[PDB]
């Protein structure tokens, strides 16, 4: 219960396996609703990400804000965690309380490679947030010259 969440934060791959072999719940969460797939994605522990999804980790888990681990991976700048979640069947059109799609998050921090990874699985280029702005609209404000080309090319 409590052990599995903090183990996911610390990046203890072996400690993950001992507790997961003990029959611990794969979709446990804190009072804020943070499943340990969120923690593995946010901290960038690629090995933990693979282990959890093998036995049926909740790929569509959400916190109080509705955040998905894909959002955390997209905003942090983690490369191979994003694709493996999309391989497992990660949703792409889910919107949080703010309405930000994972495509929007990469636009703000200029994560170029993540943009095409989600686009290959069907990311909506013309998605709107709560303010109505798009990832293309994020590029013009943040001064990211190259990132606007990819979205325009796919527009």
């Amino acid at each position: 219960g409590k052990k599995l969440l903090e183990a996911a934060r610390a990046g203890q791959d072996d400690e993950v396996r001992i507790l997961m072999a003990n029959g611990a719940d794969v979709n446990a969460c804190d009072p804020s609703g943070i499943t340990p797939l969120h923690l593995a994605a946010d901290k960038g522990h690629l090995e933990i990400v693979e282990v959890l999804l093998k036995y049926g980790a909740d790929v569509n888990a959400m916190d109080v804000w509705g955040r998905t681990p894909l959002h955390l991976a997209a905003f942090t700048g983690h490369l191979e965690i994003v694709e493996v979640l999309l391989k497992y069947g990660a949703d792409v059109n889910a919107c949080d309380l703010n309405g930000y799609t994972p495509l929007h998050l990469a636009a703000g921090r200029g994560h170029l490679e993540i943009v095409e990874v989600l686009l290959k699985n069907g990311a909506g280029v013309n998605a709107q947030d709560k303010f109505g702005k798009t990832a293309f609209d994020i590029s013009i404000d943040n001064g990211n010259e190259d990132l606007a080309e990819i979205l325009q090319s796919s527009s």
């Binding site: 804020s32 109080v64 905003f75 309380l97």
Partner: protein, 192 residues
């Protein structure tokens, strides 16, 4: 000899995060009006049997009043956990007072929703018994400073409700009032 009408038959009410702090004394209170109110259905009264509280009369007539969602009215109970009880409004335990709640959809409802009321989501501290902590500062989940300008994880304080005409009775917000009665070491109590 005190205006319980202006707190019961009023039209302007506070919210969960800013419940009104009222102290009333030097009058007589008609407790019997509740038993024949013909409009109260959730008289889940506490601390004293309705029949015992009639004859007695003391000071510390602390009164609380706000609104709450329908299905979660049960969260208002001493020693009982709940979303409001754990994060929005603590109830002082061993609460020797009494509470009233009822449905009043006829006046607190408008077409398109009533986006006026709000409630808090998270905090650092804990709800001490009988505490109101109004605040506007935004908490954080990361070291990045979300100084006024919009940010990702700077814990926007409160979120609103929606009260549409088509909303169900179970989801319709109920008006709630809270009364407490006890003593202070000072003698010569004031009855009601």
């Amino acid at each position: 000899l005190c205006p319980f009408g202006e707190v019961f038959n009023a039209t302007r009410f506070a919210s969960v995060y800013a419940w009104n702090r009222k102290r009333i004394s030097n009058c007589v209170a008609d407790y019997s009006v509740l038993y024949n109110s013909a409009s109260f259905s959730t008289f889940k009264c506490y601390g004293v049997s309705p029949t015992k509280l009639n004859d007695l009369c003391f000071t510390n007539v602390y009164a609380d009043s706000f609104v709450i969602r329908g299905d979660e009215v049960r969260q208002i109970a001493p020693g009982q956990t709940g979303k409001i009880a754990d994060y929005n409004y603590k109830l002082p335990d061993d609460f020797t007072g009494c509470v009233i709640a009822w449905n009043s959809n006829n006046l607190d409802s408008k077409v398109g929703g009533n986006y006026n009321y709000l409630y808090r989501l998270f905090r650092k501290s804990n709800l001490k018994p009988f505490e109101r902590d109004i605040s506007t500062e935004i908490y954080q989940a990361g070291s990045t400073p979300c100084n006024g300008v919009e940010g990702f994880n700077c814990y926007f304080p409160l979120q609103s409700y929606g009260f549409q005409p088509t909303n169900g009775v179970g989801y319709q917000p109920y008006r709630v009032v809270v009364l407490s009665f006890e003593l202070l070491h000072a003698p010569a109590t004031v009855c009601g």
